[PDB]
Design a protein around this ligand. Sequence first.
Ligand SMILES: NC(=O)c1ccc[n+]([C@@H]2O[C@H](COP(=O)([O-])OP(=O)(O)OC[C@H]3O[C@@H](n4cnc5c(N)ncnc54)[C@H](OP(=O)(O)O)[C@@H]3O)[C@@H](O)[C@H]2O)c1
Ligand SMILES: NC(=O)c1ccc[n+]([C@@H]2O[C@H](COP(=O)([O-])OP(=O)(O)OC[C@H]3O[C@@H](n4cnc5c(N)ncnc54)[C@H](OP(=O)(O)O)[C@@H]3O)[C@@H](O)[C@H]2O)c1
Ligand SMILES: Cc1nc(NCc2cc3cc(Cl)ccc3[nH]c2=O)ccc1C#N
Ligand SMILES: Cc1nc(NCc2cc3cc(Cl)ccc3[nH]c2=O)ccc1C#N
Lengths: 411, 411
Amino acid sequence: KKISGGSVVEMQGDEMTRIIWELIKEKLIFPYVELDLHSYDLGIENRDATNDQVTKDAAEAIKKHNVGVKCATITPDEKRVEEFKLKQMWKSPNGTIRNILGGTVFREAIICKNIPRLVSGWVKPIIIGHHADQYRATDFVVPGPGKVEITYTPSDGTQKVTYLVHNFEEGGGVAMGMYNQDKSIEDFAHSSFQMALSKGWPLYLSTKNTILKKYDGRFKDIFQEIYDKQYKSQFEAQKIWYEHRLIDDMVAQAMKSEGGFIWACKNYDGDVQSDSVAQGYGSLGMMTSVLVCPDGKTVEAEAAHGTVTRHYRMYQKGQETSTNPIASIFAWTRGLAHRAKLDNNKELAFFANALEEVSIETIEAGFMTKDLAACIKGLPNVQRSDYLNTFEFMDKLGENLKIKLAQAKLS
Amino acid sequence: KKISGGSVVEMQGDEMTRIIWELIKEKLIFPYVELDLHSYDLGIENRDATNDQVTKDAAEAIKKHNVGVKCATITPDEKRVEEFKLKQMWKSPNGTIRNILGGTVFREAIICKNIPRLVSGWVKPIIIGHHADQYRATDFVVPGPGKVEITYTPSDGTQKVTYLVHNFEEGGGVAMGMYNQDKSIEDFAHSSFQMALSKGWPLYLSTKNTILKKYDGRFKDIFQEIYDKQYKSQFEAQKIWYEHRLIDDMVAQAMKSEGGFIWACKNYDGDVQSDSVAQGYGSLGMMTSVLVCPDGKTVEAEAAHGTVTRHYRMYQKGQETSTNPIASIFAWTRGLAHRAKLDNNKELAFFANALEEVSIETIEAGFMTKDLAACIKGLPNVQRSDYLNTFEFMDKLGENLKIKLAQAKLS
Ligand SMILES: NC(=O)c1ccc[n+]([C@@H]2O[C@H](COP(=O)([O-])OP(=O)(O)OC[C@H]3O[C@@H](n4cnc5c(N)ncnc54)[C@H](OP(=O)(O)O)[C@@H]3O)[C@@H](O)[C@H]2O)c1
Ligand SMILES: NC(=O)c1ccc[n+]([C@@H]2O[C@H](COP(=O)([O-])OP(=O)(O)OC[C@H]3O[C@@H](n4cnc5c(N)ncnc54)[C@H](OP(=O)(O)O)[C@@H]3O)[C@@H](O)[C@H]2O)c1
Ligand SMILES: Cc1nc(NCc2cc3cc(Cl)ccc3[nH]c2=O)ccc1C#N
Ligand SMILES: Cc1nc(NCc2cc3cc(Cl)ccc3[nH]c2=O)ccc1C#N
């Protein structure tokens, strides 16, 4: 008998991650779990043939079913449009899914004891939620002298208000306007509080409300009042807390820490690709994300990395690859964990736990892909004997998962 | 006789760095250099007694004599007001000096062969330049539904451009105008190019011009314009170069590099206190911060760390301290090096370089403070015999500086 897993939305993607994804299904999920599988094919070719309709259906299906697990997908640029002979430059599937579901993206690196962290003392997870404000900035060029003003015009016909941004008296420059709605800050707080409670770690919000007393102040105030009104009691009953920190203070305290907290980052750039610390552990192969909706009901899980084109080109040319499947595995285990939580499914919750722990324990036992060996050894000194290829590593996790599940049949 | 060093503005500070600062003066500078020394005591008690007049006079003195070397100071919080019975929560002296002088801050880690880096590849210094954006922003509350717009009116009156920032439809929020003058971007480029030519390293500018196509577009354009018109020649002379990089590209490239480059960071997210990589090595006492004014002629140097309160507590209680003075020493050498460039002073240029080498050479020979020995071995495997205390380390440097300067009659 396999475990009854229930309703899961699954999105197939592109290139190397598509390959790894099928291995995870074939070798780690399907042998143990029976799913009411809502599979959508978000490969670039299927997205093109359906005029991106598959991406919309998949999003609507997560809304309906509450648990999405997504493979990484090609976001087409002009070079991909030539490669695939695409009908048009299809928007990022991630963009499409985000704006339908709403939510806050939380990223977390998976800790192995034998894999050096940026701070050696980091042994508990650090979980970063970003809002999105560069993404809704209206920026322009100031060609020469003149006034830049930002104005608020009430919908109710009361007096417009005007604020001077700058009087350019000599020469030009550059100017932009940025906003946040109360509604989005409330969603971000709720997603942020829901996560801390569910992982049982404390929550920090970092801002620069010393400089931006109004803009960042609003984030501090909404978080604080939603905490007091709605979450304080639950937090104290898990012996955790919420606290606001100035960014300077948060960074300082985080580098002194052991980890084990949620960090809500009111920030200009929330991209993984521009975050040194995300990029200064193992690979993006050890970075997982979850989109958490404010309801605390609906979750979408993916690897924080891309389709690993470089490795895929090697795999088409027949050459040996060593691609880290951990972030992709943890998309599955976080989705199934959330499935298990919604359905009070003790067996699926155990299984999801077992697969996370077999993943960490396999790497901790010395069995790893090249990227992780390069972290221990330095890339110049890595030998073939220090690591496993993609298929060798997936077979080793399969071996260990079988053994841990056989042993667990004593409870 | 000693070397004639000329005018230097020196700023005394607080707690552990004040102890080390005097020790550097008595053991490494004063025995070999005579200064026309303009000394300002920026200790918290003298700031309070003078109602922070000493801070304002010290900044004016830097503008007049062109070279400042500053010890770390206490930035008062509520606990410091209590501790010292302060009259007011005085503003950071760094802030007061920064906003008085303006210009570009460059932070740089000091590299030793035997001290591990956050990335092994890093064997040459990475110098980050940032302007001294979000400080001159107008932020406000959008009290309820309506249109937030930003509008440009040229002083000639020939046009009116209105951009929608956001139509608030579902309650209110916050909004914000930001600007930059072309002169400020030009000052930032000139400093960045001069630093690259002065150090013999290539220069990268990073922006987010994929999203802020115009705001960051203007940065990219002005840097390219200034390069092509007045630096390309001298860059090719010194076999270095200048390129723009998308921040997403720049980080990944940087983690896979050997270092040895200047990194102009356009980034509202951007200052040393909110940079996690810089905190890593700053808190080792291996990071300097040089403010470089537009003129090209005025610099303030300091350690990128605090007063090291915990070690001061240990010293007040008679415990042995092992505090790293390298960043404090490199503030002096960077300041003396600039003094020497201005005055065309070969003897002082030589002394400055000779002290940097002695410091690095002493650590490479295995003589270091606890934190450095902890970096190599791990704190748990550190024995007393692996490190020197504050005074033993300053004695070793002194002894080693005397040897190297005595052998300035050998070759
Ligand atoms: N759907 C998504 O979530 C998402 C997000 C980002 C990008 N993408 C898409 O992915 C495609 C490729 O983007 P990209 O190559 O810039 O980014 P990427 O696929 O994340 O790969 C960047 C590099 O990081 C390393 N790396 C990333 N994931 C790894 C893993 N699992 N195991 C080992 N090494 C790993 C590899 O470095 P080495 O080459 O040094 O070995 C790889 O070439 C694009 O078409 C883009 O649109 C999708
Ligand atoms: N003017 C400035 O330059 C400046 C900038 C920031 C802070 N500050 C002021 O500094 C005061 C104290 O702040 P803080 O103690 O949290 O920050 P800090 O002085 O940077 O020290 C923080 C920790 O970093 C390590 N560390 C820093 N410098 C070190 C060195 N030279 N050698 C060895 N270890 C070193 C120590 O870690 P361990 O304890 O684990 O050894 C120390 O406790 C505050 O009142 C603040 O206002 C001023
Ligand atoms: C323990 C660890 N956790 C990570 N979690 C995500 C994350 C942490 C983080 C921490 C800091 Cl201090 C700054 C930026 C960060 N960005 C991240 O994406 C990322 C890297 C590492 C490491 N090493
Ligand atoms: C070799 C080295 N150089 C440093 N230079 C300054 C610096 C580099 C840097 C690099 C990156 Cl990839 C990201 C942020 C950074 N911030 C900095 O302040 C900082 C740390 C280290 C180290 N290890």
